[PDB]
């Protein structure tokens, strides 16, 4: 019997690559994201284009694209649909967050209201939904993607970086509370990754002059690739490492060290 | 003229002792308080008994008891009133939070909203109100009280400790973002303190067998007094130390070491 | 043109397991350790027996067991022999440390001198030996095994825990000082692992119920295996992840969260 | 009548002078250890001849100790033996430790490595071993070990120095927790960008405003810390007013180590 791996926001960021890598390791996948083709605001790899590659790797694919992951209902709905299809949930990769930057005294009630939703509510409702089935099974592995800024909340990223630290804080407590059930909850915070999502936050967009200045701010003088991030993320979701929980791993080329 | 120091939730916890020593250090006082049934500090010393003593120490007191610090309007209104009374704001001690404990999967949507309001809203709107008058003056010292759990979000205090950890991160960024203006924003996190609030929550206010057990959980084998906590807090708000900002300080007899 | 992977104290702990998986990933190997067989003073797997298996996995092997890794000579010499055999060093796993425990005030000038040599001198000399060949090549992946006590130096393990924390600090700085040359240097710190060393130093066999008392102390209620550890270790040395450096990874089932 | 005793090492510079004045104001008798001599000497920012005079006007007696090697058991053990014979008690101790060593990690020699270990680690291990017995017997005591803000963020060009300082904090943490049940506190203060010679020389900005202008700009609060500020914070951990912190590390670098 093939285990199941849930990957939220799987139309972009690490989802696609992680989906291919998790399939190779013998997992069935339940991708969540934005339904659509390459010409979409939040889609860089479509479901159908993915389902054909994951099927050649021997994986069945449930897809979910009609849930507000910032609410209890949307998260519980996703999990209820995952369990009726496959009847199990062994791994969950909850990608969370809304990026908002600027001066702390220019932040508005709306910005403050919506950064808590992306960075904290997605984590709280996401974990309340994925854990119950893992607790009953006696084994599970979760990876909550927060942000490297949570490890070092810096100026001009105050509310965004602070709430991410709160997310990592929740992850630690939750990772240790359910460790005695064989369920692992860990956090992975990235920064300076090579994907269009981060290219929108920083006005580099492949610009050689602006790209070089961004690559200069990281100790390893390069941006991270989704092939690298998927490898380490799968290491915490493929049952090959069951001795880490409640921890936060900075993945930013030495930036968050 | 005398420097002005604001103290929130000043009827309990560190408020009383802090105002006593700050007056001894030459500060005028703005004491904020609340008797709302849903508040964590409580009423340990009434403003009626405090203004009497603090006036014997040479301080003029402004009292505020009709503002909700979980909202922008309440905080902004509170700062309108201090600047009309004294025309300046130098030090600010923002006590925040709303205690909620339990197993992560037993948390309700309102317990999750009550902790976001106490632990994060009071800080976002509190800091957005005290900083402008300090930045204009080019000087200022702020201390926001979070909790020792922010440095170690443990099981059974997942969303409390977690949101405290998010507030400590906000403090880090804000304390650095406004360091250029000579503004200090630090955060103190306490635990195992000797005051009616904690004594009653742990059911050790009239129990010797309980206190002995409770105190054995602190490396220093005792509960911290408010004179100790005010002495440490006053050193970050009396002008004697202008070289620490954006930092978190554990105050728990080593529990958070 | 297979890349080379150096592993030290490869007769026990992670050495044996790591070698196999590194061989599985296409690495020629250089193994340091002691001579003997059958846990004969730290020999969990004799070199004679390892090369046999590592050869079936298509990996050449060089053995070194006559150097003192607490000195500049032994380390600089060990690398002289690695490069004359293969002419390259792409990965290095430096295992370091001599265990000492007891009351801090009962420690002697001898115990203090010993733990410094195992926990600090080995790291300092080791890194000065493996880095040069990687800096020249422009690529390299190093891992220094310290101890989970380095993330939380506790009583009864003061000098041992502190010196480990010193090792981590070095690894942090060194990992950042050479990230611009494309060289990674990270640290792993374990505790409660299922291997003769910890088992003997914790009364594993003899009071076998004591093992249950020890497992109760780990959040995940188990001892880690060298397969899990080698999988994580290999992931920082197999070239799949080149976006982390100067970081410390606790590996103690959450005990260091 | 009966005054508490406070031991301060390396008292001729850094924080010792400003710390000795505020401790005496708080009613403490003092034990000053330093590399004694006149102001014209290296590391001597304020001679004991002048310090002792100032502290007596503040109502504090003073004992001087200037012939011990604080990197060895014999030195610290002797220092404390002479402290007890004079005052019969030891209540507070501020152990200043370390020896600055910077540069690229590869360029580090066995002698540099051996020396940063003796300054950042040997002084801590032996110092705490000598200070704690009388404090434990007295059921109460407070120690502050001065490491370095680098211990909180070991950066490039300061590897072995910051690394060993990190270990120093780790020892302070373990030792601070192990003896908390005896009423004894041990904490660590790590500073940087302080306005005093030792740092001004290391940073290569002693007589240069242009370079110091750059140095201060590296600090969030855009200035260098003063010994009055540091002595104030330090005295709070040694004057009996705060007995609820131990095994902790306090960064004091204007936000640089936040």
Author numbering:
A (entry chain G), B (entry chain E), C (entry chain A): 6 to 262
D (entry chain D): 5 to 262
What does the literature reporting this entry say, word for word?
Halohydrin dehalogenases (HHDHs; also, haloalcohol dehalogenases or epoxidases, halohydrin hydrogen-halide-lyases) are biotechnologically relevant enzymes for the production of chiral epoxides and β-substituted alcohols. In their natural function, they catalyze the reversible dehalogenation of vicinal haloalcohols with formation of the corresponding epoxides. HHDHs possess a catalytic triad composed of serine, tyrosine and arginine.
After solving and inspecting all of these crystal forms, two (T123G_1 and T123G_2) were chosen for final refinement and analysis, since they encompassed all structural changes with respect to the structure of the wild-type protein. More significantly, the flexible loop connecting strand β2 and helix α2 (residues 39 to 47) adopts a different conformation in three out of eight chains in the asymmetric unit of crystal form T123G_2. As a consequence, the loop moves towards residue 123 and leads to a partial covering of the active site cleft, resulting in significantly restricted access to the active site. It must be noted that this different loop conformation is enforced by altered contacts in this crystal form as the position of the loop in its open conformation is occupied by crystallographic neighbors. However, to form a crystal in which the closed loop conformation is observable, this conformation has to be present during crystallization. Therefore, the T123G mutant favors the closed state more than the wild-type enzyme. In variant T123G, on the other hand, the additional space generated by the missing side chain is partially occupied by L103, resulting in a slight displacement of a loop connecting strand β4 and helix α4 (residues 101 to 107) that covers the catalytic triad. Therefore, even though HheG wild-type and variant T123G display similar RMSF values, the average loop positions are very distinct. This partially closed conformation for T123G is in line with the observed loop conformation of some chains of the asymmetric unit of the T123G_2 crystal form described in the previous section. Variant T123G was the most active one with a 5-fold higher initial reaction velocity in the azidolysis of cyclohexene oxide compared to wild-type HheG.
